């Protein structure tokens, strides 16, 4: 159901961020056929996730609220991870509550 091997992802949000500030990355599926994109983010806080589909691709925004390591799993057209997933993002700053 589409080819996860043809999905690329890039941007600052894949590597890091700071608490209470939004991070962004882009997932490009344009040559990967038609399939469902899955993005999950797991770590020391539950993040809010937005995706806006632009010409350059799926623009994903999230805001981490605690410092530490977040795992960003990106799968396409089934259970398979795209190349580089799960990405580990390191977030710094105060734990916000
Ligand atoms: Ni999207």
UniProtKB/Swiss-Prot annotation:
Filamin repeats: 1-91
Post-translational modification remark: Ubiquitinated by FBXL22, leading to proteasomal degradation.
Residue positions where Phosphoserine is found in the record: 85
Tissue specificity of this protein: Highly expressed in striated muscles. Weakly expressed in thyroid, fetal brain, fetal lung, retina, spinal cord and bone marrow. Not expressed in testis, pancreas, adrenal gland, placenta, liver and kidney.
Places the protein is found: Cytoplasm; Membrane; Cytoplasm, Cytoskeleton; Cytoplasm, Myofibril, Sarcomere, Z line
Recorded superkingdom: Eukaryota
Involvement in disorder: Myopathy, myofibrillar, 5: A form of myofibrillar myopathy, a group of chronic neuromuscular disorders characterized at ultrastructural level by disintegration of the sarcomeric Z disk and myofibrils, and replacement of the normal myofibrillar markings by small dense granules, or larger hyaline masses, or amorphous material. MFM5 is characterized by onset in adulthood, clinical features of a limb-girdle myopathy, and focal myofibrillar destruction.
Further information: Silenced in MKN28 and MKN74 gastric cancer cell lines due to aberrant methylation of the gene.
Similarity section: Belongs to the filamin family.
Subunit structure: Homodimer; the filamin repeat 24 and the second hinge domain are important for dimer formation. Interacts with FLNB, INPPL1, ITGB1A, KCND2, MYOT, MYOZ1 and MYOZ3. Interacts with sarcoglycans SGCD and SGCG. Interacts (via filament repeats 17-18, 20-21 and 24) with USP25 (isoform USP25m only). Interacts with FBLIM1. Interacts with XIRP1; this interaction is mediated by filamin 20 repeat. Interacts with KY. Interacts with IGFN1. Interacts with MICALL2. Interacts with ANK3. Interacts with SYNPO2.
Protein task: Muscle-specific filamin, which plays a central role in sarcomere assembly and organization. Critical for normal myogenesis, it probably functions as a large actin-cross-linking protein with structural functions at the Z lines in muscle cells. May be involved in reorganizing the actin cytoskeleton in response to signaling events.
Protein name in UniProt: Filamin-C
Native source species: Homo sapiens
Gene giving rise to this polypeptide: FLNC
């Amino acid at each position: 159901a589409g080819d996860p091997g043809l999905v690329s992802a890039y941007g600052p949000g894949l590597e890091g961020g700071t608490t209470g500030v939004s991070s962004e990355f882009i997932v490009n599926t344009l040559n990967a056929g038609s399939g469902a994109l899955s993005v999950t983010i797991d770590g020391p806080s539950k993040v809010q996730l937005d995706c806006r589909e632009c010409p350059e691709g799926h623009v994903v925004t999230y805001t981490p609220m605690a410092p530490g390591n977040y795992l960003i799993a990106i799968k396409y057209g089934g259970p398979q991870h795209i190349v580089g997933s799960p990405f580990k993002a390191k977030v710094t700053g105060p734990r916000l509550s």
